[PDB]
Design a protein around this ligand. Structure first.
Ligand code: ADP
Ligand code: VO4
Ligand code: MG
Length: 692
């Protein structure tokens, strides 16, 4: 048994190392210590001081240096007996305070122990390096073990959700929270791997193909949906809820993926030191000479959509090698050789479209002097270069019932070219998902375990509509944890009348949530929609209306004195300033019909489905207007949350160690802000003084 064999990889990599004689001598000491702030300015940096004396309400301790301080006992962060350092469950700590919880996490982290239980949920601190703990051997160890019999691990929480699904015959969900780069996606991959193993079928010839396809579905979406941002080299630019389905016997019957709002703006713009989607780089590097030739491809520096950030490479990653993986994932899933080539023609097409350089003519209208890029794109897409040309600069619209040809200037033509690009990429992503889903859904499920992997809370120098939608989602996931951890728990106790005194844990993201998606009174999204459908509305009339409604009226809103185009929203993870530029068009997500017409007549079959298929090319109509991006997203986020409520949830809180993606550098301030806003210690207090 590996569990008990101290010489195993398990003990080696998942268990705390045996202390020595000198450590024992320290462990049996009678001295008592306290965690204090050497600087009262920096409350997150602590040192350990020894308590030398005590009055009825105070403690006098010594500081690392030559001095002595006194503190009220009710204001003291006592240090747990060292025997607790490295404990696998922090609900077991004598003293439960901030420095105490961080210290234990730090102790384990320094030994590459990234998993630690914090009551009923698991905490995960990003190692930022590889650790040999997700091997098939490790999987087999956790197979069927009770949470307290084995070490903290993502495999452990997975098996528990699994047994609960079988024992209670109820649906389960694994909610992995964390800001950008914290490790949500890696752990998500692990939960899938584990379930696929312990619950898959290992018959031969035809058998186990499903579980292999389930696994191969991730690398495809990652190539089209992930990209390098300043916070993560493999940031997920789309949200995801994966449904692992099981039959009545408890065997994987299949799975479906529900994607959420891809960043469609990234295809045409990346800020300095960021990349466009990985796929653009894997194609340009992994394509053969013929493909490269029949596609009119060149190097990254040759494409406007790939040479503006100044970054075409990611340290330690080979796009060429990555491309081989992607294509192999597509094969296994089932993408015909034809479909794939179409998929790359689109990628190549999008690249050429970004090369089209519009210029002014003799008048205000725009013209296209060089038609190389235009011709190239038209070729790979299989569309009439002249139809496409007029559809870009002179799209036709109705003026009443009259058909009027527009003559878009340079700026307008470029924006229209970008809208096409984004619609193009956006629909492709949805097609890929649809496709994969038809492969994985081959049997009526009896039960499922939902694994959520959203885009994490993020902040950049410039925050736009995209960031608001992302942080709004994180804000709701957090309230989901607060709701379940405290509100429902206590609402239960008090219902049974088990003699409980209500506790206010001070965790509530409702005010921030209402400010964003509030309807009555109208929140930010509601006002955005109003203005969005108001003809004479501008980004300036939108910000003015936003300030008007919330400035000095809502505690979570702020009208900055340093700017006229930004507004702040106080989230659980911090205040974020948002730039209002282009919000109206982003929410409208416009696309000229002449452009759609031009592509509905494409020779390529994939391209044609993206423009003739209702689910992909059609847009819901909220009456006289198309449903807005905000209204649809608010709507889809509401379904999810309603789906989660119908399951038994298990939380995994990923914690990022620092802001530099560096291993072995656990930064207190970075880590303590997360433990605080995530409500980790309150999560431990409810499990400790309550009735689980
Ligand atoms: N458990 C882990 N083991 C090894 N590396 C990890 C782990 N978790 C995270 N990483 C590293 O951190 C990066 C970011 O994690 P990721 O899961 O992609 O963030 P996210 O999904 O939270 O936005 C990974 O690409 C990987 O380098
Ligand atoms: O950087 V992550 O967006 O996948 O949270
Ligand atoms: Mg991710």
């Amino acid at each position: 048994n590996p569990i008990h064999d101290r010489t195993s990889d398990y003990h080696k990599y998942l268990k705390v190392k045996q202390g020595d004689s000198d450590l024992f001598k320290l462990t049996v000491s009678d001295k008592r210590y306290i965690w204090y702030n050497p600087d009262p300015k920096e409350r997150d940096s602590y040192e350990c001081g020894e308590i030398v004396s005590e009055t009825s309400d105070s403690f006098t301790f010594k500081t690392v240096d030559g001095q002595d301080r006194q503190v009220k006992k009710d204001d003291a962060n006592q240090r747990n007996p060292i025997k607790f350092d490295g404990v696998e469950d922090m609900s077991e700590l004598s003293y439960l305070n901030e420095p105490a919880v961080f210290h234990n996490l730090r102790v384990r982290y320094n030994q590459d122990l990234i998993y630690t239980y914090s009551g009923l949920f698991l905490v995960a601190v990003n190692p930022f390096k590889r650790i040999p703990i997700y091997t098939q051997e490790m999987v087999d160890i956790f197979k069927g073990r009770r949470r307290n019999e084995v070490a903290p691990h993502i495999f452990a929480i997975s098996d528990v959700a699994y047994r609960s699904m079988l024992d209670d015959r109820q649906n389960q969900s694994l909610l992995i929270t964390g800001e950008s780069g914290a490790g949500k996606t890696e752990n998500t991959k692990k939960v899938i791997q584990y379930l696929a193993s312990v619950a898959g079928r290992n018959q031969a010839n035809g058998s186990g193909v499903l579980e292999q396809q389930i696994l191969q579905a991730n690398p495809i979406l990652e190539a089209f949906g992930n990209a390098k941002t300043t916070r993560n080299n493999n940031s997920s630019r789309f949200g995801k809820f994966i449904e692992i389905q099981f039959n009545s016997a408890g065997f994987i019957s299949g799975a479906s993926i529900q994607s959420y709002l891809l960043e469609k703006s990234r295809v045409v713009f990346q800020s300095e030191t960021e990349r466009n989607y990985h796929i653009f780089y894997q194609l340009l590097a992994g394509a053969t000479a013929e493909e490269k030739k029949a596609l009119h491809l060149a190097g990254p520096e040759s494409f406007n959509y790939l040479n503006q950030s100044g970054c075409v490479d990611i340290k330690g990653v080979s796009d060429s090698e990555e491309f081989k993986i992607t294509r192999q994932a597509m094969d296994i899933v089932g993408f015909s050789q034809e479909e794939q080539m179409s998929i790359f023609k689109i990628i190549a097409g999008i690249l050429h479209l970004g090369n089209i350089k519009f210029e002014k003519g003799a008048g205000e209208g725009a013209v296209l002097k060089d038609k190389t890029a235009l011709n190239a794109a038209s070729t790979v897409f299989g569309v009439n270069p002249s139809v496409l040309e007029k559809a870009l600069m002179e799209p036709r619209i109705l003026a009443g019932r009259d058909l009027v040809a527009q003559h878009l200037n340079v700026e307008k033509s470029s924006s229209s070219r970008d809208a096409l690009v984004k619609a193009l990429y956006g629909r492709l992503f949805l097609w890929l998902v649809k496709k994969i889903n038809n492969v994985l859904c081959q049997e009526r499920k009896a039960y499922f375990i939902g694994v959520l992997d959203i885009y994490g809370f993020e902040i950049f120098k410039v925050n736009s509509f995209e960031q608001l939608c992302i942080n709004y989602t994180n804000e709701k996931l957090q309230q989901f944890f607060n709701h379940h951890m405290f509100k429902l728990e206590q609402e239960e106790y008090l219902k049974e009348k088990i003699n409980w005194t209500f506790i206010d844990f001070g965790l509530d993201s409702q005010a921030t949530i209402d400010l964003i998606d509030g309807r009555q009174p109208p929140g930010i999204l509601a006002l955005l929609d109003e203005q969005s459908v108001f003809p004479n509305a501008t980004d300036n009339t939108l910000i003015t209306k936003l300030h008007s409604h919330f400035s000095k009226k809502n505690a979570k809103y702020e009208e900055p004195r340093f700017s006229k185009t930004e507004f702040g929203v106080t989230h659980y993870a911090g205040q974020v300033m948002y730039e209002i530029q282009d919000w109206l068009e982003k929410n409208k997500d416009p696309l000229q019909q002449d452009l759609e017409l031009c592509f509905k007549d494409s020779s390529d079959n994939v391209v044609t489905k993206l423009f003739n298929d209702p689910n992909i090319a059609s847009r819901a109509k909220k009456g006289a207007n198309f449903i807005t991006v905000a209204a649809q997203y608010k709507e889809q986020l509401a379904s999810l949350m309603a789906t989660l409520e119908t399951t038994n949830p298990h939380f995994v809180r990923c914690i990022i160690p620092n802001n530099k993606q560096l291993p072995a550098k656990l930064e207190d301030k970075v880590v303590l802000d997360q433990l605080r806003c995530n409500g980790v210690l309150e999560g431990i207090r409810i499990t400790r003084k309550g009735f689980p």
